[PDB]
Design a protein around this ligand. Structure first.
Ligand SMILES: *[C@@H]1O[C@H](CO)[C@@H](O[C@@H]2O[C@H](CO)[C@@H](O[C@@H]3O[C@H](CO[C@@H]4O[C@H](CO)[C@@H](O)[C@H](O)[C@@H]4O)[C@@H](O)[C@H](O[C@@H]4O[C@H](CO)[C@@H](O)[C@H](O)[C@@H]4O)[C@@H]3O)[C@H](O)[C@H]2NC(C)=O)[C@H](O)[C@H]1NC(C)=O
Ligand SMILES: *[C@H]1O[C@H](CO)[C@@H](O[C@@H]2O[C@H](CO)[C@@H](O)[C@H](O)[C@H]2NC(C)=O)[C@H](O)[C@H]1NC(C)=O
Ligand SMILES: [Ca+2]
Ligand SMILES: [Cu+]
Ligand SMILES: [Zn+2]
Lengths: 612, 606
C-alpha cells in the first residue's frame, strides 16, 4: 500500500548516424545523482511505474533538462498539486507548482489508486495507461517524455510475488524531430527504428502480454500485425492491433512455434518509415458434427471488367464522366483485370454463375474450426500468381510440408502460367472466433507474388472462418494506374497511344476506381426481403492508405453484441455485422466519408416484400 | 407508453467564440428547439442544457415509445432531418425540406434502436441534415437523440433525472465548407477545434455534483483527421459494449456516438481535452466544475460580512433602503421596500461563486403584513450582460415563492445551482410593498470555504492549547474554549498576563487548506473583552513557524468590535498547513478569543 519513485527528467542522446533529445529516467539518490539500471528494450521509454488498487505512488520529479517540463498521469487520481497541468486550477502556487516544473526544478508528485481508479470486473489484470509532460505536449512528447503507467488488481510483483506472466511494454511512437526543440523525422517502436530493439522473447508453449501505448502529436494512424500470430484485445480475436492517435490498450499473443517474427505497421507510406522490430520465441525451461473437408478448384483468370455497368452519365459535363465516359486520354469505365474465378472440377472448363451481388470478388471460401479447406488452384493468365489466405495459419502444399524448390515460405512461391497447385488450409480454434467474437469473423484471400499489384490488378475474394456451431460487401479502391495490365489497357483504349505519360496530375485519377465490390457509382444494387435478417461480412481491402466509415442509409447493425450507426474500417481489417432488417425503401449504402463517395464508391440497397 | 413530440426547426445565427477575458463573424445554421406548431416562441435553453452549445436539442425517448419531430426549415437553403433510426412505411424514393417549409417525421422506437440490457440506461444516437451529409455539418446542424430504457425518463419532468447527462461533440469546424461563403483565396486560417462548437476554453456549461454519476455522450464527425483522442483529467469512466470496461481515454472515430459513465473524484474545476498535441494547442481544453453540495454556507448578509455597499435597488421607498435588506435586521426601521411597480435588487458577491439558495423575508409596518410574494431570479458572472434563472425542467423560467407573512422565512434552493458574481432578484407579486430581508446561501468556486470543526467540537478538546492562559480558584479560560459559538461557564480562551507576542494553537490532525478565520470576543459580566487586531503564524513541523505575510506586509488581521459578532478574514494565498496560530496584537479590555477556522482537505501528508 505505498510506492516511492525517485524519477528525473534528463536530456540524453538517441537512435539505433542520426538524432538526440530529452526523456524520463530512474535514479536512486536522495539529493540528485546516478542510480537506475535500465533493461534493453524499454528503449527511451521513461521507467515503467506500477501500482495496485490501494497503493499510493509517490514520484519525486527532478527535471534536469533546459526544458520546462511536468508529470501528467492519466487514469489515476490525485488532488490539484499533482496532475501537473496548467489551465484554471484557480489555486495558489503550492497548488500550481506541479503545473510546470522550471529547468533545474525538483518538485514531488502524489498519485493514489482508489477502488474507483482500478480495473473492471472483466477486463485485463492491469489496465494499460501512461504518463507524460503536459506543458507543450507537441514539444514534450516528441522530445521523449512518456513512461508506462500500470494500474493493477490486488495481485502484483510487490505484493503476490508468483505473478509469473510474460510481459513487455510496446510503445508505437511517431517522433517528429522538427517539433522538438529542433531549431528532419524518426517514426519508431519503443525508440528503435528499422528493426533494432532486443528484448522480445516469449516461451514456446505459453503466452505473451503486451501493454500497448499509441503515441504521436498528430492524427496519423497505424495497423500493426505480428507475423503468423493473432491478438487478443478485450476478448476478441483481432489479427491486427489498430493503433490510433493516442491509444492505451492491453493485448495478448500466445506464441506457438519457435522462431523470429516481425511485428510492424501494414499501412502503405509507413513501409520505410521503419516502425517494426523482431519478436523471438525459443523454449524456456520450466523447472530445470465431425469436421468437413471443404474443397474448391479456383483459377486466376483474365476477364475484362466493367466498373460501372448499365449506368452512363453522358457528356464530359460531369465529374463522373471523367472516371467512366472514355476520352481523348482517359481509358475510363472498362479495364482488363485478373480475378479469381471458381471452376467445377480437376479440369478447368465451365464454372458457377457470375455475381451481380458480389462483383469482382472471387468465390466465397468458408470453413469452421477443425475443418480443412482444399484449394486446387490453376493459373490461367500471363503472370506467376498464387493463393494465400490471411487469418489462417496452417497452409502447406497438400501431401508434404517441405515447401517446394527454393522458397523459405509459401506466400512467395509463384504458380507459373498454366500450372496447378494443391494447397491444404487446415483450420484451428486458435485462429477462429471466440465466445465474445461475432461468431463468424470475416477475412480474405489474395496473391502475394506482388502484394498489391496482384490485388489492385483484380485478385481478391472473401474468406470466412467461423465457429463450430451470405452478404459480402467489399470496399476496394483499385489503382488501375498500376495494374500489371495498365499498359495493355492503354494500348487498346486510347487515341493511338503515343503521348503516354503515366505520371500526370488529372489523368492519373481516371484510373483510380473507388468501388464497392468492384462496382462504382451507384451501380450494383442489392435486393433483400424486408424482415429477412442478414449477416454482412464487410471489409476494406486494397482500398489504399486511409480508414473507412461504412454507411447503410437508415439502418442499424449489430456489431459485436451492440447496436451501431456506422462501422469503421482500417486497411486490411474486415469486420462482420448483423442487419435486423425490416426497414423498406431505397437506401444508399456508401460510406460517410464524403471525400471518396462521389469519386464513385456507393451502392443502393432495396428492401421489399417477397413470397418464399 | 408515450408519443414524444418535438417542435424543432433549422435556424440561421452568428457564431463566434470571442471569449471572456477585433473579433470574427460567421453565419452558421443550427437546429433550434422551438415551442408550439406556430414556431413562435423558441424554447429558452436553461442552465440545464447550457452546454449543448452549437448542438440542437436533446430529443429523448423510451423504447416502446414514439418520436415525432415536426421540422421547419426557417433557413435560406434546403435542409433535412435524418438520423439512422428514423424508420418508414412502404410503397419515387426519399426527401428534403425547402426553405420556409415544414416536414414531419413520426416513427415507433424498436429494441433495434435501443440499449442492450448490458448497455447504459440510455444510448446516444446522432441526427443531422443529409442534404449534404458533409457540408450540412460544418454549416452547423447536429444534435443528439437519446433512446432510453423503459421507466427511465421521468414523467413530465423532462428526461432521465438521477444522473446528470452531458453531450460533448468534437470536430474541426472548417469554414471553407459551410454553404455560407459570404465574407469580410490567399492561404488558410478558419479551423475551429470545437467541442459542441467552442474553440479554446469557451464551452460554458459543465455544472455537476460530486455525488451524481454522470453519463457523457461523446461524438466525432467527418474529416478522416477527426480522430479525437479524448481525456478527462484526473477522472476515469466505464464503457457499455459487451461487459463493463474501465478506461481513461476514449478515441472517437467519425460517427461513433459513445456513452460513458463516471463518478467524480474530488471537487473543483477540471478539464476535458483531446490529448493529441497539435489538436489541443489549437483549442480543445474545456472545463467542468464538480462542486460539493455538502458545502452550502451563508454568504454573509447575516452578519454585515457583505458590507453596506454592494447591494443595489431599482429604487426605494423613502428611507427603507436595500442595505437595510439583510436577513433578520431588527427594529421596525428595517429591510428594503418600494411601492414602485417592477423593482429589483442586486448583490455583487464581489467574486465568481456558486449560490445554492436564497432565504427570503418580510417586515411588520404598523399592522400591515409587508413581504415579497412571488419573484424570479437574474444573475451575471461578469457584470454587464445578465441572465435569467430557469432551474430544472420548468418551462420559460423558474418562478419562486416568497413569504406569506411579515417574518416567515422561505428558503428556495437553486436546484441546479447558480454560478455567478452578481445576483438580482425581481419581485412579481407582493403584499403592499415589495419588501425584503434576505441571506444568500453559497460557497466559493473550489467548494472549499467550510467550518473546520472548532465550533463543531469536530476539532478535539486538547487538540488546542495556548501560550498559557488565565485560570484561578474560580475560572478556567482553557484554550480548549476558543470556540466560535460556545456559551459556557468561562467561555473562551484568555491568556494569563496580556502579551503582544501571545498565541493560541490548533493542531489540525492532517494537512488542511485554510480560507480564513472567524474571530470573537466574550462578555464576563465584567466587561466585553475582544481582540482588535491579530497575526497568524503557521507551522508545519511543530516548532518552526513562518508568520503570515501578505505582500511584504506581515498581514495584520482585522478583528472584532464587541463581545458577540463573528468577524472573519479571508486568506491572501489560501494557507496549506497542519499548524495554525493566531497572535493577538492589540485587544480591548482583555485578550479573549472564541473563534473558528475555515477551509478543507488538501494533499494529506508530503
Ligand atoms: C433539479 O433537477 C435535477 C435533475 O436534473 C435534480 O437535482 C437533484 O438530484 C438528486 C439526484 O436524484 C436528487 O436527490 C437524491 O439523491 C440522493 C443521492 O444519494 C445516494 O446515496 C446512496 C448511498 O447510500 C447511493 O446508492 C445513491 O446512488 C445516491 O448517491 C438519493 O438519496 C435520493 O434517492 C432517494 O433515496 C431515498 C433514501 O432515503 C429513498 O427513500 C427514495 O426512494 C429516493 O430514491 C435522490 O436521488 C434530488 O432530486 C435533487 N436535489 C436538489 C437539492 O436539487 C432535481 O430533481 C431537481 N431539483 C428540485 C426540483 O429541487
Ligand atoms: C532505415 O533507414 C533509412 C531511414 O532513415 C531508410 O533509407 C532510405 O534510403 C535512402 C537512400 O538514399 C535514404 O535517402 C532515405 O532515408 C530512404 N529513402 C527512400 C527513397 O526510401 C530505410 O528506408 C530504412 N530501412 C528499412 C529496412 O526499412
Ligand atoms: Ca495543478
Ligand atoms: Cu482531437
Ligand atoms: Zn505506421
Amino acid at each position: 500500500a505505498t510506492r516511492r519513485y525517485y524519477l528525473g527528467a534528463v536530456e540524453l542522446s538517441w537512435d539505433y548516424v542520426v538524432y538526440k533529445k530529452t526523456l524520463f529516467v530512474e535514479f536512486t539518490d536522495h539529493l540528485f545523482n546516478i542510480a537506475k539500471p535500465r533493461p534493453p528494450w524499454m528503449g527511451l521509454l521513461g521507467p515503467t511505474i506500477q501500482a495496485e488498487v490501494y497503493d499510493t505512488v509517490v514520484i519525486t520529479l527532478k527535471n534536469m533538462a533546459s526544458h520546462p517540463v511536468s508529470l501528467h498521469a492519466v487514469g489515476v487520481s490525485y488532488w490539484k498539486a499533482s496532475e501537473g497541468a496548467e489551465y484554471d486550477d484557480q489555486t495558489s502556487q503550492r497548488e500550481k507548482e506541479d503545473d510546470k516544473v522550471f529547468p533545474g526544478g525538483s518538485h514531488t508528485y502524489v498519485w493514489q489508486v482508489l477502488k474507483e481508479n482500478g480495473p473492471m470486473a472483466s477486463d485485463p489484470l492491469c489496465l494499460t495507461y501512461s504518463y507524460l509532460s503536459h506543458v507543450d505536449l507537441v514539444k514534450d512528447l516528441n522530445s521523449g517524455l512518456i513512461g508506462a503507467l500500470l494500474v493493477c488488481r490486488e495481485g502484483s510483483l510487490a505484493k503476490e510475488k508468483t505473478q509469473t506472466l510474460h510481459k513487455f511494454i510496446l510503445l508505437f511512437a511517431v517522433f517528429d524531430e522538427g517539433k522538438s526543440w529542433h531549431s528532419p523525422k524518426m517514426h519508431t517502436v519503443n525508440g528503435y527504428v528499422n528493426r533494432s530493439l532486443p528484448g522480445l522473447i516469449g516461451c514456446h508453449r505459453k503466452s505473451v502480454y503486451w501493454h500497448v501505448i499509441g503515441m504521436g502529436t498528430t492524427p496519423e494512424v497505424h495497423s500493426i500485425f505480428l507475423e503468423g500470430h493473432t491478438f487478443l484485445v478485450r476478448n476478441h480475436r483481432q489479427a491486427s492491433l489498430e493503433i490510433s492517435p493516442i491509444t492505451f490498450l492491453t493485448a495478448q499473443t500466445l506464441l506457438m512455434d519457435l522462431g523470429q517474427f516481425l511485428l510492424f505497421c501494414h499501412i502503405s507510406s509507413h513501409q520505410h518509415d521503419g516502425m517494426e522490430a523482431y519478436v523471438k520465441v525459443d523454449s524456456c525451461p520450466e523447472e530445470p458434427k465431425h469436421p468437413k473437408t471443404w474443397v474448391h478448384y479456383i483459377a486466376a483468370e483474365e476477364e475484362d471488367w466493367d466498373y460501372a455497368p448499365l449506368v452512363l452519365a453522358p457528356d464530359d459535363r460531369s465529374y463522373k464522366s471523367q472516371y467512366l465516359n472514355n476520352g481523348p486520354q482517359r481509358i475510363g469505365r472498362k479495364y482488363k483485370k485478373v480475378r479469381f474465378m471458381a471452376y467445377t472440377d480437376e479440369t478447368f472448363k465451365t464454372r458457377e454463375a457470375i455475381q451481380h451481388e458480389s462483383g469482382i470478388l472471387g468465390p466465397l471460401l468458408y470453413g469452421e474450426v477443425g475443418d480443412t479447406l482444399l484449394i486446387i488452384f490453376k493459373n490461367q493468365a500471363s503472370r506467376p500468381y498464387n493463393i494465400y489466405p490471411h487469418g489462417i495459419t496452417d497452409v502447406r502444399p497438400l501431401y508434404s510440408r517441405r515447401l517446394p524448390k527454393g522458397v523459405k515460405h509459401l506466400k512467395d512461391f509463384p504458380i507459373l502460367p498454366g500450372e496447378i497447385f494443391k494447397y491444404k488450409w487446415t483450420v484451428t480454434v486458435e485462429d477462429g472466433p471466440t465466445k465474445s467474437d461475432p461468431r463468424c469473423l470475416t477475412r480474405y484471400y489474395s496473391s502475394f507474388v506482388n502484394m498489391e499489384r496482384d490485388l489492385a490488378s483484380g485478385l481478391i475474394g472473401p474468406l470466412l472462418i467461423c465457429y463450430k456451431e451470405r452478404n459480402v460487401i467489399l470496399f476496394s479502391v483499385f489503382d488501375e494506374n498500376r495494374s500489371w495490365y495498365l499498359t495493355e489497357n492503354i494500348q487498346r483504349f486510347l487515341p493511338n497511344p503515343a503521348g503516354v505519360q503515366l505520371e500526370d496530375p488529372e489523368f492519373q485519377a481516371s484510373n483510380i476506381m473507388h468501388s464497392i465490390n468492384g462496382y462504382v457509382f451507384d451501380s450494383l444494387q442489392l435486393s433483400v426481403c424486408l424482415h429477412e435478417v442478414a449477416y454482412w461480412y464487410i471489409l476494406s481491402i486494397g482500398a489504399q492508405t486511409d480508414f473507412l466509415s461504412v454507411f447503410f442509409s437508415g439502418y442499424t447493425f449489430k456489431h459485436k453484441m451492440v447496436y451501431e450507426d456506422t462501422l469503421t474500417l482500417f486497411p486490411f481489417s474486415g469486420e462482420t455485422v448483423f442487419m435486423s432488417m425490416e426497414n423498406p425503401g431505397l437506401w444508399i449504402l456508401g460510406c460517410h466519408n464524403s471525400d471518396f463517395r462521389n469519386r464513385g464508391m456507393t451502392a443502393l440497397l432495396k428492401v421489399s416484400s417477397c413470397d418464399k | 407508453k408515450k408519443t414524444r413530440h418535438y417542435f424543432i426547426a433549422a435556424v440561421e445565427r452568428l457564431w463566434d467564440y470571442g471569449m471572456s477575458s477585433s473579433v470574427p463573424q460567421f453565419k452558421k445554421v443550427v437546429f433550434q428547439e422551438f415551442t408550439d406548431g406556430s414556431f413562435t416562441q423558441p424554447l429558452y435553453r436553461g442552465e440545464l442544457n447550457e452546454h449543448l452549445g452549437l448542438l440542437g436539442p436533446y430529443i429523448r425517448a423510451e423504447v416502446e415509445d414514439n418520436i415525432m419531430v415536426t421540422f421547419r426549415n426557417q433557413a435560406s437553403r434546403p435542409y433535412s432531418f435524418y438520423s439512422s433510426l428514423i424508420s418508414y412505411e412502404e410503397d419515387p424514393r426519399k426527401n428534403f425540406v425547402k426553405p420556409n417549409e415544414t416536414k414531419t417525421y413520426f416513427w415507433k422506437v424498436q429494441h433495434h434502436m435501443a440499449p442492450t440490457k448490458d448497455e447504459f440506461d440510455c444510448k446516444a444516437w446522432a441526427y443531422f441534415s443529409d442534404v449534404d451529409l458533409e457540408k450540412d455539418v460544418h454549416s452547423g446542424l447536429i444534435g443528439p437523440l437519446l433512446v432510453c430504457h423503459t421507466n427511465t425518463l421521468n414523467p413530465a419532468h423532462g428526461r432521465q433525472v438521477t444522473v446528470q447527462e452531458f453531450a460533448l461533440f468534437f470536430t474541426i469546424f472548417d469554414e471553407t465548407k459551410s454553404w455560407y461563403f459570404t465574407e469580410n483565396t490567399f492561404k488558410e486560417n478558419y479551423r475551429f477545434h470545437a467541442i459542441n462548437g467552442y474553440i479554446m476554453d469557451t464551452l460554458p456549461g459543465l455544472v455537476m455534483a460530486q455525488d451524481q454519476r454522470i453519463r457523457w455522450y461523446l461524438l466525432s464527425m467527418g474529416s478522416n483527421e477527426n480522430i479525437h483522442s479524448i481525456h478527462f483529467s484526473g477522472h476515469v469512466f466505464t464503457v457499455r459494449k459487451k461487459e463493463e470496461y474501465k478506461m481513461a481515454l476514449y478515441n472517437l472515430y467519425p460517427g461513433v456516438f459513445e456513452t460513458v459513465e463516471m463518478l467524480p473524484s474530488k471537487a473543483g474545476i477540471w478539464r476535458v481535452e483531446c490529448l493529441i498535441g497539435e489538436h489541443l494547442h489549437a483549442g480543445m481544453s474545456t472545463l467542468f466544475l464538480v462542486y460539493s453540495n455538502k458545502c452550502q454556507t451563508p454568504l454573509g448578509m447575516a452578519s454585515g460580512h457583505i458590507r453596506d455597499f454592494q447591494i443595489t435597488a431599482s429604487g426605494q421607498y423613502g428611507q427603507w433602503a436595500p442595505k437595510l435588506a439583510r436577513l433578520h435586521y431588527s427594529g421596525s426601521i428595517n429591510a428594503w421596500s418600494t411601492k414602485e411597480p417592477f423593482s429589483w435588487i442586486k448583490v455583487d458577491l464581489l467574486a465568481p461563486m456558486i449560490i445554492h439558495g436564497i432565504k427570503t423575508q418580510g417586515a411588520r409596518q404598523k399592522f400591515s403584513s409587508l413581504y415579497i410574494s412571488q419573484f424570479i431570479i437574474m444573475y451575471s458572472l461578469d457584470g454587464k450582460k445578465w441572465q435569467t434563472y430557469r432551474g430544472n425542467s420548468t418551462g420559460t423560467l423558474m418562478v419562486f415563492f416568497g413569504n406569506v407573512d411579515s417574518s416567515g422565512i422561505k428558503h428556495n434552493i437553486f436546484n441546479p445551482p447558480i454560478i455567478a458574481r452578481y445576483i438580482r432578484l425581481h419581485p412579481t407579486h407582493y403584499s403592499i410593498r415589495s419588501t425584503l430581508r434576505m441571506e444568500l446561501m453559497g460557497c466559493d468556486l473550489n467548494s472549499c470555504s467550510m467550518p473546520l470543526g472548532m465550533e463543531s467540537k469536530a476539532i478535539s478538546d486538547a487538540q488546542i492549547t495556548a501560550s498559557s492562559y488565565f485560570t484561578n480558584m474560580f475560572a478556567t479560560w482553557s484554550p480548549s474554549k476558543a470556540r466560535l459559538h460556545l456559551q459556557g461557564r468561562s467561555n473562551a480562551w484568555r491568556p494569563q498576563v496580556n502579551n503582544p507576542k501571545e498565541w493560541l494553537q490548533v493542531d489540525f490532525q492532517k494537512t488542511m487548506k485554510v480560507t480564513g478565520v472567524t474571530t470573537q470576543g466574550v462578555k464576563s459580566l465584567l466587561t466585553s473583552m475582544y481582540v482588535k487586531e491579530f497575526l497568524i503564524s503557521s507551522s508545519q513541523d511543530g516548532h518552526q513557524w513562518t508568520l503570515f505575510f501578505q505582500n511584504g506586509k506581515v498581514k495584520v488581521f482585522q478583528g472584532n468590535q464587541d463581545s458577540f459578532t463573528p468577524v472573519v478574514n479571508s486568506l491572501d494565498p489560501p494557507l496549506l498547513t497542519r499548524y495554525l496560530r493566531i497572535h493577538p496584537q492589540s485587544w480591548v479590555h482583555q485578550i479573549a478569543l472564541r473563534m473558528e477556522v475555515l477551509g478543507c482537505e488538501a494533499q494529506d501528508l508530503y
